[PDB]
Each structure stands twice: as C-alpha cells, then as structure tokens.
Write an enzyme that holds these catalytic residues in place. Structure first.
Site, PDB file in Angstrom:
ATOM      1  N   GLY A  52      -1.530   5.057  -2.590  1.00  0.00           N
ATOM      2  CA  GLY A  52      -1.693   5.646  -1.265  1.00  0.00           C
ATOM      3  C   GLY A  52      -0.558   5.295  -0.324  1.00  0.00           C
ATOM      4  O   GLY A  52       0.419   4.640  -0.702  1.00  0.00           O
ATOM      5  N   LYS A  53      -0.698   5.745   0.923  1.00  0.00           N
ATOM      6  CA  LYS A  53       0.338   5.489   1.919  1.00  0.00           C
ATOM      7  C   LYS A  53      -0.261   5.405   3.320  1.00  0.00           C
ATOM      8  O   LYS A  53      -1.428   5.743   3.553  1.00  0.00           O
ATOM      9  CB  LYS A  53       1.437   6.555   1.908  1.00  0.00           C
ATOM     10  CG  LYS A  53       0.947   7.906   2.338  1.00  0.00           C
ATOM     11  CD  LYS A  53       1.944   8.993   1.954  1.00  0.00           C
ATOM     12  CE  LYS A  53       1.293  10.350   2.074  1.00  0.00           C
ATOM     13  NZ  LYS A  53       2.187  11.476   1.673  1.00  0.00           N
ATOM     14  N   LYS A  74      -4.019   6.189   7.232  1.00  0.00           N
ATOM     15  CA  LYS A  74      -4.093   5.798   5.821  1.00  0.00           C
ATOM     16  C   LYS A  74      -4.617   6.941   4.960  1.00  0.00           C
ATOM     17  O   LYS A  74      -5.595   7.575   5.300  1.00  0.00           O
ATOM     18  CB  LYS A  74      -5.054   4.633   5.613  1.00  0.00           C
ATOM     19  CG  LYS A  74      -4.753   3.372   6.373  1.00  0.00           C
ATOM     20  CD  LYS A  74      -5.931   2.428   6.284  1.00  0.00           C
ATOM     21  CE  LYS A  74      -5.939   1.652   4.995  1.00  0.00           C
ATOM     22  NZ  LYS A  74      -6.456   0.281   5.231  1.00  0.00           N
ATOM     23  N   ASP A 181      -6.863 -12.337   1.567  1.00  0.00           N
ATOM     24  CA  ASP A 181      -5.430 -12.118   1.375  1.00  0.00           C
ATOM     25  C   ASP A 181      -4.705 -12.392   2.679  1.00  0.00           C
ATOM     26  O   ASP A 181      -3.788 -11.659   3.060  1.00  0.00           O
ATOM     27  CB  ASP A 181      -5.162 -10.689   0.882  1.00  0.00           C
ATOM     28  CG  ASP A 181      -3.758 -10.493   0.297  1.00  0.00           C
ATOM     29  OD1 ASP A 181      -3.369  -9.315   0.119  1.00  0.00           O
ATOM     30  OD2 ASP A 181      -3.032 -11.487   0.022  1.00  0.00           O
ATOM     31  N   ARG A 185       2.402 -11.086   5.555  1.00  0.00           N
ATOM     32  CA  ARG A 185       2.609  -9.673   5.233  1.00  0.00           C
ATOM     33  C   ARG A 185       1.409  -8.809   5.633  1.00  0.00           C
ATOM     34  O   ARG A 185       1.541  -7.584   5.717  1.00  0.00           O
ATOM     35  CB  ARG A 185       2.871  -9.490   3.740  1.00  0.00           C
ATOM     36  CG  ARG A 185       1.687  -9.975   2.883  1.00  0.00           C
ATOM     37  CD  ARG A 185       1.943  -9.847   1.361  1.00  0.00           C
ATOM     38  NE  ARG A 185       0.841 -10.496   0.649  1.00  0.00           N
ATOM     39  CZ  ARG A 185       0.793 -11.810   0.391  1.00  0.00           C
ATOM     40  NH1 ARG A 185       1.766 -12.612   0.792  1.00  0.00           N
ATOM     41  NH2 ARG A 185      -0.231 -12.327  -0.249  1.00  0.00           N
ATOM     42  N   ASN A 186       0.255  -9.425   5.901  1.00  0.00           N
ATOM     43  CA  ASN A 186      -0.970  -8.756   6.326  1.00  0.00           C
ATOM     44  C   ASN A 186      -1.283  -9.009   7.799  1.00  0.00           C
ATOM     45  O   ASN A 186      -2.431  -8.827   8.231  1.00  0.00           O
ATOM     46  CB  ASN A 186      -2.132  -9.192   5.431  1.00  0.00           C
ATOM     47  CG  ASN A 186      -2.175  -8.419   4.124  1.00  0.00           C
ATOM     48  OD1 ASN A 186      -1.820  -7.225   4.090  1.00  0.00           O
ATOM     49  ND2 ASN A 186      -2.613  -9.062   3.065  1.00  0.00           N
ATOM     50  N   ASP A 199      -5.590  -5.499   6.103  1.00  0.00           N
ATOM     51  CA  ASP A 199      -5.354  -5.470   4.655  1.00  0.00           C
ATOM     52  C   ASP A 199      -4.447  -4.268   4.440  1.00  0.00           C
ATOM     53  O   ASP A 199      -4.907  -3.125   4.515  1.00  0.00           O
ATOM     54  CB  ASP A 199      -6.646  -5.339   3.840  1.00  0.00           C
ATOM     55  CG  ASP A 199      -6.386  -5.205   2.325  1.00  0.00           C
ATOM     56  OD1 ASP A 199      -7.373  -5.077   1.558  1.00  0.00           O
ATOM     57  OD2 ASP A 199      -5.214  -5.216   1.889  1.00  0.00           O
TER      58      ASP A 199
END
Length: 336
Positions: A52-53, A74, A181, A185-186, A199
């Site tokens: 996905g993107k 999303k 997580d 980066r999140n 996420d």
C-alpha cells in the site's frame, strides 16, 4: 500480509503473563467516518510499501474549522488481498475506539463504499522524526556550540519531542492500547512541531527494511523490543516503555541507529540476556539518560508508566512550555 501493529488488551492476568487482545472483527463499524470520495483530491505519494501507500491530499467539507484541509490518505496496492482490506477496516475500528489525541496521527474520515478503501488521516508536513533529525543535525550542532560559548533544532525541541511522545503513549496506554513498534520512524512531526505517533507500516517494505528481522512468519523490530517480547513473545504497555527508552536514544543521538554497529545475532541476544544496555548518546543530558535506563529495567513492573514519564519530563520543561502545550491540546480537541 499487511496489518496494523497496534493491539488493544481486553483482559490481562494479575501477573501479566497472559492476556487477550480485542479482536477487531468482533466490533461493528458505524459509518460516522464515511466521507464522499468526490470531496477528496489526491496528490503526490508520501510513502510507498509492499502492499500500500500514503498519499498527500486535500479534503473539501471534511472539517468545519477547515473547509479546505490538507490531509494524508492511506490506501492498499491494486493486488491487495481481501484479508488485508479487512485489516484496513480493523484499523478504522481501533482508531474509533481510541478517540482523538494531539500526539497521535488522528483519523479524519474514510471512503469505504463505491471504490477502493481510503483512510483519511492528519497530514504531518515534516515527515518522520528520523529524517527530520538527520536533516537538522548540523543546525542542532551549531546551536549547541553557540550555547557552549554563550528555524533550527534545539535541546528544547528534543525535550519537547520526548514529552509529546510520552503524552501520546500515556493516551494509548490509558486505552489499554499497545503500540508494539514504537520507534522514531513511527513518530511524525506536524506543523508547529507537534509530534504524532503512528503505525506507518502500510508504507514500508518490511522484507527490505534493516530495522526489522525475520522470525518465522514475520519481521520484528528486535532492537526496539523488550526482552519479554523478543524471548517470550509478550507485548504489554510495559514492553512499549522499553521501546520508548530506545526511541529516546534515537532522539538524543539525532537519529542514530540503536546498538550501532551490532547485528541482531546470537551474541546480540546473549548480551541482552546478560544485562547489556546502550551507553549515553552524545546529546542526552544525564537526566535524560537516567530516564532511558529506567525504561530498560529487565523487570517490566519496575519500568515507569507513561504517566510517570510524562510527569518526569514536565520537570525538565520550562513552565511556559507546558502552558502552550496545554492550550494547543485544548485548541485541538475543540476543533470542529
């Protein structure tokens, strides 16, 4: 294979070694979030992954405060399996259950009929914290030198990020939600330097991402995982607290790689079992390093709660910072 990392704990034992996660499939979906696809204009891709993107967009009539509003969207890839389409729906239910908070990437709307599924979310101009810290490394360094001898990035920013993540995680934990997580980066950065936990899994390719390691079925963010998660597959809010300390190490290394130069192999795991902890990063104060070390208690129940962490960090912030934060948080909850 796409699904969100987050879980909501339905019940947990007194010891905390057994728990049940809410199954999102059990919950009905009300369509309070449904928004007409015609009110959405899509732009450039912000991140793209295996299935996905996430795309930049403009929403018309989605907000009353902002009838023309920049958003992110999303969406799955064309091939995406039914199971994963259901995972997107599950994500809608989990967000609905949480409700709004200033320091998460909030759900704004969704397009679920007459087309591909879209999840409409807050747009974060500065992107993820890793990239933002890397790009502002030398500016921080310059500020530090000037402060040493006497628009950018300051230590006050780093403590602000630290506080806002603690507040966002306190909110999730207050909802029995486990992130699983938590890492720089999140964490995304919005205008006004508002940090927003998310996420971002949909937009990553997990197989080619060196922050994750294969185990069995899946790829795990081992360097951010608490020992009871690595060894025993247990994930509670106290496990997230461990991750939060690893994130603080990323923040105060200005985006450094945890356990730098160490590969996740048998000697890595043996060092963790032996009690190895990272050294202080270059730009952490002693108080900040103390916070990390407390988060890295081998015993989960001895780790501080996210409420306790928010309280500790408020003592490092100037009194007027807190007053601006509370006003912005108020403004946010009143929006629309």
């Amino acid at each position: 294979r796409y699904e969100i990392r987050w879980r909501v704990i339905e019940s947990i034992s007194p010891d905390g070694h057994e728990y049940i996660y809410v199954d999102p499939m059990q919950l009905p979906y009300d369509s309070r979030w449904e928004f007409p696809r015609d009110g959405l204009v899509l732009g450039r891709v912000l991140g793209s992954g295996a299935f996905g993107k996430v795309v930049e967009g403009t929403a018309y009539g989605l907000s009353r405060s902002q009838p023309v509003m920049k958003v992110a969207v999303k969406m799955l890839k064309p091939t995406a399996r039914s199971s994963e389409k259901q995972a997107l729906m599950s994500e809608l239910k989990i967000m609905t259950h949480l409700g709004p908070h200033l320091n998460i990437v909030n759900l704004l709307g969704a397009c679920t009929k007459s087309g591909p599924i879209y999840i409409i979310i807050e747009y974060c101009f500065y992107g993820d914290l890793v990239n933002y810290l890397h790009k502002n490394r030398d500016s921080f360094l310059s500020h530090k030198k000037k402060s040493m001898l006497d628009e950018g990035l300051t230590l006050l920013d780093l403590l602000s990020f630290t506080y806002q993540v603690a507040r966002g995680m306190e909110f999730l934990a207050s909802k029995n939600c486990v992130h699983r997580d938590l890492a720089a980066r999140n964490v995304l950065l919005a205008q006004g330097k508002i940090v927003k936990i998310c996420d971002f899994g949909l937009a990553r390719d997990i197989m080619h991402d060196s922050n994750y390691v294969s185990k069995g079925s899946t790829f795990l963010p081992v360097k951010w995982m608490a020992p009871e998660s690595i060894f025993d597959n247990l994930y509670t809010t106290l496990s997230d607290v461990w991750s939060y300390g690893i994130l603080l190490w990323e923040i105060f290394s200005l985006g450094g790689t945890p356990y730098p130069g160490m590969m996740v192999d048998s000697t890595f795991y043996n060092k963790i079992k032996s009690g190895y902890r990272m050294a202080k990063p270059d730009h952490a104060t002693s108080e900040v390093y103390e916070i990390m070390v407390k988060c890295w208690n081998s015993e989960p129940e001895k780790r501080p709660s996210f409420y306790h962490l928010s309280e500790i960090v408020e003592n490092l912030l100037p009194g007027q910072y807190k007053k601006s934060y509370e006003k912005i948080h108020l403004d946010f909850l009143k929006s629309d």
